[PDB]
Amino acid sequence: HHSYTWTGALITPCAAEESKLPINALSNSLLRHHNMVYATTSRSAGLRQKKVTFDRLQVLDDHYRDVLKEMKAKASTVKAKLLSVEEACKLTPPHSAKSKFGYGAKDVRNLSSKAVNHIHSVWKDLLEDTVTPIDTTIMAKNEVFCVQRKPARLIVFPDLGVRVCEKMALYDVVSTLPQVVMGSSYGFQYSPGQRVEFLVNTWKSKKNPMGFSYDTRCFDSTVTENDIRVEESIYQCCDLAPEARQAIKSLTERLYIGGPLTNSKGQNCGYRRCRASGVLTTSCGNTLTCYLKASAACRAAKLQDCTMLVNGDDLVVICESAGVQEDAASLRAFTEAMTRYSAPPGDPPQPEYDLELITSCSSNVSVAHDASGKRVYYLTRDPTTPLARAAWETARHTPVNSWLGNIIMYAPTLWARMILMTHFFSILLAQEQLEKALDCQIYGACYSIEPLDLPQIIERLHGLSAFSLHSYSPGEINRVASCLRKLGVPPLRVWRHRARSVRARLLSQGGRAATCGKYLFNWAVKTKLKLTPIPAASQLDLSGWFVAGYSGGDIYH
Ligand SMILES: CN(C)N(c1cc(C#CC(C)(C)C)sc1C(=O)O)C(=O)[C@H]1CC[C@H](C)CC1
């Protein structure tokens, strides 16, 4: 029951790949230790193939089936609709991978006859054939990190025509089902501020809280044919059109369960019998399966009053403590149960009795103070990867602007405000590009965002306190400072000076630009303004943000 089998053909690049951090005139203003930053390339694909290839064994007990029955009962309340061809086309990112059948993402978005005809033919074929595995392409991802190097992650995805069909059959399902099945445990329904609120309120709801994150080793590879069929059985609990039931059955049999892997040059690389990382159902499937396995494991371990928080393969559990010794024993039992279910750990879990010490989705809860001096909880993370990616983006235009996504998601943090806002608004000003919409990703979905709208977005998501936080925790301050020394980033005095300059120039522009100056950089001046609500904020349609996760699912808004 191997996760993959391989022919020996190589995983190949579809374009020239750079590993070394590109440098321009702006690089040193952000960081000096350039050799610390790198991008992964296909040259390490082989190392990744070795790590992701293993046999899976699965022993399923009564706890597992009990939880599954409960999940199905909730799923049976869901009613889901097919998307029209047009609706599905409009969810396609403008720069999504072109089809091998003579049309591209722009053709799809424009409803061109060629694209629409092909999409219709793929759909008809899904209804007519529920057996033949569907081809997929395997690629090595090019992602940027700071040293201590990782081998490239792999991405596996079907052709554009198939991706459009996935949306038609399953977009409504994967957008609505998880919150119904998992309720408050479904992580993607929360903005960062809402996630912090759920965590804190959950922590406070326990008499003696204990919590832990659980890291499954190579989660996608641990997902078995059983797991993927169980996921389909959950989808089929929904009230669906018969046409939708057939398309979903077909996609499960032909795509989700496994299929051939083809490299960028059309060679057969091998065969997958685990989760594909680049299909619409990757996020929802991982979320449901992680939740199922973990909920059953809690019962096997006899953890008391477990509250889970699940985002794909990312898992946090907060429960009622039974004592330090009992807690540690129960956690080992939990891990043993997860392992029997084919979800063994990478790092062994550790019980935590301080909420701020739990890291999940690479983030943690921390505390600062607003202008009135009151304690405010917010979401932060180690800034190392955000800053390394920011350095790459300083010198190269890339498909996704991580710096923009990070400012949005981590707006209240010491590091995003001091460094990312300052650095990138300086660059935007110099190039007169403040109004140019840029692509970023939020929970895996792609969004086109004008940087001038940032103050409203931030106020809607985080509230006005995001612009006045100060007196950060010693732990957070030290982590940021350590990162700055590691990468060779300039000191606070430098950033404050640059911020005052950026702010001054923004104010002189008037309009939204002045709003950016006033709100984003109020922290940098001696005599601070008392910030009030931004009128146009109400106008933004953020209904669609923070509904569901779409990592790998080729979704655009
Ligand atoms: C108290 N004063 C000196 N601070 C302030 C500066 C801090 C720092 C730092 C290093 C990581 C460079 C060591 S923490 C902090 C703190 O407020 O805890 C502020 O006013 C900050 C408010 C937020 C803004 C983005 C940057 C300045």
UniProtKB/Swiss-Prot annotation:
Substitution effect: residue 281 to V: Almost complete loss of RdRp activity
Cofactor: Mg(2+)
Coiled-coil regions listed in the entry: none
Activity regulation details: Activity is up-regulated by PRK2/PKN2-mediated phosphorylation.
Catalytic reaction equation(s): RNA(n) + a ribonucleoside 5'-triphosphate = RNA(n+1) + diphosphate
Post-translational modification as stated in the protein's UniProt record: The N-terminus is phosphorylated by host PRK2/PKN2.
Annotated residues for binding of Mg(2+) 2: 215, 313-314
Chain positions with Phosphoserine modification: 29, 42
Domain named RdRp catalytic: residues: 209-327
Outcome of substituting residue 313 to E/H/N: Complete loss of RdRp activity
Cofactor binding note: Binds 2 magnesium ion that constitute a dinuclear catalytic metal center.
Membrane topology: Single-pass type IV membrane protein
Effect of residue 220 to G/N: Complete loss of RdRp activity
Compartments, record wording: Host cytoplasm; Host endoplasmic reticulum membrane
Assembly with partners or alone: Homooligomer. Interacts with non-structural protein 5A. Interacts with host VAPB. Interacts with host PRK2/PKN2. Interacts with host HNRNPA1 and SEPT6; these interactions facilitate the viral replication. Part of the replication complex composed of NS2, NS3, NS4A, NS4B, NS5A and the RNA-directed RNA polymerase embedded in an ER-derived membranous web.
Protein's job: RNA-dependent RNA polymerase that performs primer-template recognition and RNA synthesis during viral replication. Initiates RNA transcription/replication at a flavin adenine dinucleotide (FAD), resulting in a 5'- FAD cap on viral RNAs. In this way, recognition of viral 5' RNA by host pattern recognition receptors can be bypassed, thereby evading activation of antiviral pathways.
This protein's name: RNA-directed RNA polymerase
Organism: Hepatitis C virus genotype 1b (isolate BK) (HCV)
Positions spanned in the full protein: 2422 to 2981 of 3010
